Amino acid sequence: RAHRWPQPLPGNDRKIWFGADYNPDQWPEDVQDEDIRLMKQAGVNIVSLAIFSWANIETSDGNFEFDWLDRVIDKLYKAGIAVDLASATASPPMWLTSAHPEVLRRDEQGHVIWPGARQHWRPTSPTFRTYALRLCREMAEHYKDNPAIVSWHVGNEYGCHNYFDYSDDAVQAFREWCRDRYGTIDKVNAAWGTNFWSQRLNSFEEILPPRYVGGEGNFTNPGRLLDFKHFCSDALKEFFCAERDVLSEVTPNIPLTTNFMVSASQNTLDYDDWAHEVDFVSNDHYFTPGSWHIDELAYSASLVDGISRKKPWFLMAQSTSAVNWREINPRKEPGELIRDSMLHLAMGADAICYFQWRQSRSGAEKFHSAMLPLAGEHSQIYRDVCALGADLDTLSDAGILRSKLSKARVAIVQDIQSEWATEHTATPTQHIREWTEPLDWFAAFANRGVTADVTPIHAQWDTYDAVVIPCVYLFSEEMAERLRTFVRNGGKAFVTYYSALADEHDRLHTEGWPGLIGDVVGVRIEEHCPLGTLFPGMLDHLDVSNGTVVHDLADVIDAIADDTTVLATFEADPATGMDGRAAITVHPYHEGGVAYIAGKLGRDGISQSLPEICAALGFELDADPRAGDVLRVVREQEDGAIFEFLFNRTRNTVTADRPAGDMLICSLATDSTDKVTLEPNGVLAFRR
Amino acid sequence: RAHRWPQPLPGNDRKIWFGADYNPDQWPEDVQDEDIRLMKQAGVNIVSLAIFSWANIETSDGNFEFDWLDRVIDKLYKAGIAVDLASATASPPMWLTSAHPEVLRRDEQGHVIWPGARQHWRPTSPTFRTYALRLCREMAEHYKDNPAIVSWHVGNEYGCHNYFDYSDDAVQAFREWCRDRYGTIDKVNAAWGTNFWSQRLNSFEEILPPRYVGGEGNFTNPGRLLDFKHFCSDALKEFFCAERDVLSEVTPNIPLTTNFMVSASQNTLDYDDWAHEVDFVSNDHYFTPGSWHIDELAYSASLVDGISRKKPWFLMAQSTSAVNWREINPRKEPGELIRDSMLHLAMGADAICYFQWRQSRSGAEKFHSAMLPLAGEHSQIYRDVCALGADLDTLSDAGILRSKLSKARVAIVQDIQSEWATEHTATPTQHIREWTEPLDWFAAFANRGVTADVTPIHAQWDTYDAVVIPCVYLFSEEMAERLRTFVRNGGKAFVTYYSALADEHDRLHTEGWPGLIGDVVGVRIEEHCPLGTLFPGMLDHLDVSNGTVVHDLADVIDAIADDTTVLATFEADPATGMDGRAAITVHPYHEGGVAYIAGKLGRDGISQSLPEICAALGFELDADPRAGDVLRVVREQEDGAIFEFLFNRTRNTVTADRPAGDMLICSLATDSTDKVTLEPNGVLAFRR
Numbered sequence A, B: 001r002a003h004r005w006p007q008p009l010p011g012n013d014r015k016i017w018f019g020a021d022y023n024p025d026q027w028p029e030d031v032q033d034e035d036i037r038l039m040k041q042a043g044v045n046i047v048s049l050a051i052f053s054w055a056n057i058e059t060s061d062g063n064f065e066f067d068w069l070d071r072v073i074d075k076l077y078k079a080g081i082a083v084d085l086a087s088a089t090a091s092p093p094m095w096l097t098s099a100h101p102e103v104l105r106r107d108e109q110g111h112v113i114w115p116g117a118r119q120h121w122r123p124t125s126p127t128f129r130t131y132a133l134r135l136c137r138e139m140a141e142h143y144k145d146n147p148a149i150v151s152w153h154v155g156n157e158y159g160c161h162n163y164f165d166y167s168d169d170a171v172q173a174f175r176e177w178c179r180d181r182y183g184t185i186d187k188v189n190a191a192w193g194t195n196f197w198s199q200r201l202n203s204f205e206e207i208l209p210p211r212y213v214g215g216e217g218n219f220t221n222p223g224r225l226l227d228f229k230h231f232c233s234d235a236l237k238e239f240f241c242a243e244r245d246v247l248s249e250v251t252p253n254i255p256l257t258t259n260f261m262v263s264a265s266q267n268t269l270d271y272d273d274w275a276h277e278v279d280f281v282s283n284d285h286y287f288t289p290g291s292w293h294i295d296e297l298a299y300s301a302s303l304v305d306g307i308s309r310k311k312p313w314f315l316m317a318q319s320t321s322a323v324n325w326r327e328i329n330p331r332k333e334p335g336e337l338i339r340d341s342m343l344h345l346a347m348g349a350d351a352i353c354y355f356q357w358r359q360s361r362s363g364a365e366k367f368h369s370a371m372l373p374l375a376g377e378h379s380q381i382y383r384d385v386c387a388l389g390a391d392l393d394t395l396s397d398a399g400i401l402r403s404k405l406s407k408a409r410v411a412i413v414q415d416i417q418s419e420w421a422t423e424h425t426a427t428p429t430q431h432i433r434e435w436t437e438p439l440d441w442f443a444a445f446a447n448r449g450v451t452a453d454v455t456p457i458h459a460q461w462d463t464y465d466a467v468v469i470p471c472v473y474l475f476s477e478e479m480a481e482r483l484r485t486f487v488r489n490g491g492k493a494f495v496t497y498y499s500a501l502a503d504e505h506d507r508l509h510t511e512g513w514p515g516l517i518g519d520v521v522g523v524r525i526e527e528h529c530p531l532g533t534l535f536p537g538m539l540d541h542l543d544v545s546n547g548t549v550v551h552d553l554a555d556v557i558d559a560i561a562d563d564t565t566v567l568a569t570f571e572a573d574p575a576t577g578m579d580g581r582a583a584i585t586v587h588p589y590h591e592g593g594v595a596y597i598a599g600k601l602g603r604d605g606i607s608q609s610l611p612e613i614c615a616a617l618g619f620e621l622d623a624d625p626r627a628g629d630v631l632r633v634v635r636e637q638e639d640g641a642i643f644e645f646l647f648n649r650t651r652n653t654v655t656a657d658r659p660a661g662d663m664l665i666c667s668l669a670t671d672s673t674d675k676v677t678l679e680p681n682g683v684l685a686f687r688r
């Protein structure tokens, strides 16, 4: 599927896009001149329109009014502001759900999901599909021929709320998905191990989705659950593809996207898979408060880039300050608004947008920050948004557009499907999920001055000097071979606990762990040692001999190969059986290359262990112990021009080596002759 | 009923049974010769088969095939391995629930319980009874005279998930049980105090089970709830009785059992009552991780013996290492495999089995340990299993079989009905339940080198030298006469807070606590003093004058009798009204015998207080301050042979006086001329 990036309005140059969700249909019409006036002053040059506007467009069944939308598009176009137009199909009107309550999502207990919030429709309902596909057709027909429209924003965050449906529509389509993937019922029975607890299937007609099995102390089929999660993603991908085929047929030159929600902990949609279906990848991401703020945002933006295969990507939403949807919504500290935007940009984005333009006075999102606060033009956030628009204009003129996130020395593998598998309630421990571990390695390498590339499992991590395999619970035979081949030919691999436990069907590998690849890794494990404080006197941590500490889970390593070296061992009470067992090992395999980390060390423990592990593998690290003070993010043009961003990672002002080049952008920082200065949350960009 | 013990295969001697749930229907057929081979090598002499095999026996309605099952039974019989055969009725096929969804269990809130796990049937559903009782006939008809079958494993773990059903079948059957228990509606009104909040019943037709009352802040009738729990247990007991009757009719000489879930915390089925319905008692028990590991398993096994009235019993399931069903599933430490089995064996088991033979690759229980792990015969678990089989063969040859768990000096009373009663949500505090107290008493006497016998309340505790009455919340007049008579004639009693609060209908006794027994105990209490940290500045503990601390709840002892002595008082801020009040008293009554403990002490508090209490009661305790280091469990033959087992209770290697006689078994232990050595988790057995 070819990359096609939204293009300028007629007579404008190519620029970093900079905008917001705009919702003028929630204000009186006469607010729009001020909006536009402030958007111009802020250097805003695109808005996303009509995302949730279904009910103000098809105002009653069969009745489509476009006037208010055409008027504001006109006003925006005359001002030089492009329009990312939504399909308007995110959330249906009251008249549609009143009249057809059968579009309503059902939860795992059979609860109806009422109107009164959003995205409360069943992804596989035919009635709902027909309405959507009609609105799509009407929107497209009305706006082909309209030159303000530069891209389609199809739907909105599919499966954010409606990922899991259990309606009879879902019952039916999950069967058909099973028939299509498995052909014959006996193939389904093998994939799921239905000979456990009299679950054996006679026919496809017998397959149900994992509805309520009584809650706690009751365990649903794990392979079925995996496939169900797969199916839920596919069902909405299918729905999205249909909406987009309809818009594209009528407006073939108009590039189409939908907004992803890629973040460290996202555990529903398989975005890498959806990525084959969009003309350019776009993402919505909101900061994690506290210490994780910087590293988890960088990690995420890197993964977007990975999912993107290094094509430029579109930041469709983030917050200027507080969000509204956590138990506690911290505000952003000074400089974090410009800094976070620059982090997404540094990680390859060529568009930077917010939810949303103007703060609502009312509705569930009234407390969600915006580009123009209820406090108005004379506010810190608006001033900062203006400074940010100028910075992006400056970076547009410096020629940053279309440069790629340069290729890191290390790839960190991310794998939603391994994440699904690790969510079963009957694993060795609920305290391990796949998603935390790749983030831990990303931060630890950053701590040692290394910017890793986060890559989905199907991307080309096997072309990097090095790869991290973190809790990659699912290993197929083709994955085994890819990994084997990689290390054979000179690859360095860091491989952790919880990797290669099962095949792609969640069928646990036999004869010892890691499954399939024990030859490459040169380690053998018969069982896990989970850790915690569930009951008094439980073994709750395991010290490691280099001064670190494992929590949640260690591997019990039974034996290692003759040419495996032990870098570190566990230190425990002798009654545990863990004392003196191998905790960190290194093992050659032809021209590589394999380190094994036999429990959860956390960002800090990985970081402590990195020098020793890398030395033994041949992977070179900056000797500077200031290495972790700053995150260094580099985009490259094919023509040779290099853009390097620096971010302070820490809670004090730091000083660092000035890179070569022209200083382009600076927030809470200072350029000098030898040394660059960065305040907390400061950032610099250089071209060289 | 008559004790019948499963008998050897033709031409075999009697041996301790040693085996597992075996699940050949989950594996390809050609795997069996390997199973049988490794079984022989491990000394396994029995397996339990077809427990969840409905779907592969009645493969469609009325269609019964037995081929695969006769095949494996033949391989096993050839290899000298007996079969404990299931009714196969534990969990119905997908075709049966497809066609008759009215079998599905209904929860407290009316949700359907779907297939996809197990035991999702209504205990009183007449349709499901029909199906089950036919499958029973077919199994019995097909296997009568087949000499490999040495026992029936009827259903599985009744009430493990389906204990509480709220379907119309349960509605209708609860009325019937009430009509049969009370005769007239006025007696129902009397037992449950329905004149509170306009609940008085006009007829049995108005009797409903305790469905949802709106949750938090709403409180269901506690007398009704009590009887409802009794009913849920009787309703499943009856189902079992019917299944079993259909089986012993066809096969009058094959002894039958069903697997109980006796453990310190279980709080559903009344196992002592069900024990009347089996030919021999069998139990599934899984370790508590941490400090509680040893004491809670010995407690539970002791209770099985008590429930068994000291007849030999059958450990039907336990884990070689980790289970799969806690949020954190720790593995067993080295030696705990053999030690735990020896603990069950020491407490009176003549048969030791695991769930399960071979670790599943798939299904909800794939992470549950087995005798033969995924990692294969080359694994520590399988090696330890082999050692254990040799050990149980050794003990077989020593003549342990049918030795009885010796009579302790103190019985500790357990009482499922009191447990039920203490579960209501409007008691003085939710941090008091009956079940923790007898366990605390077991562990404490053990710390003072006394192995108590845990006895259900209807067993003969009134024939021990001492009894512990721990939170026996329900006290009928007959129970009070039993305790009075026991103490009159020279008994020694330890009686705690939360005893004799209410009659057998949960109707609180009047005129002061403990009710009925105030004369025997010598203490009068008007109200409780609950303790905890729910609001700032709440009274959260009360120190006691012998240096212990009470938590969660204390009595307010208002007055003691003329001849009651105070051994210890509460110490507290004077404003509490608790400072100087009686905390532990002792009171003679004719030739006995009564100590009263007015609050929750913990294992440590009881342990610290035992010497002063036992000295004052005249109960002799070992003078050795090392007494708590090892747990001594003792089985006896009529011919006077004696099997003494010794277990290290502690987390350090311990040393102790060598027992007289022949060393039989050692694990993580060591023999010597004067002293015996036990490592943490060690065990030794001797015969004399």
Ligand SMILES: OC[C@H]1O[C@H](O)[C@H](O)[C@@H](O)[C@H]1O
Pocket: A021, A156, A157, A259, A284, A286, A317, A318, A323, A324, A355, A368
């Ligand atoms: O932070 C809240 C924000 O989240 C995403 O960006 C949605 O697509 C927005 O419309 C809004 O709900």
Ligand SMILES: OC[C@H]1O[C@H](O)[C@H](O)[C@@H](O)[C@H]1O
Pocket: B156, B157, B259, B284, B286, B317, B318, B323, B324, B325, B355, B368
């Ligand atoms: O610990 C899990 C295990 O527990 C009990 O023994 C059940 O009867 C088994 O069938 C199995 O589910």
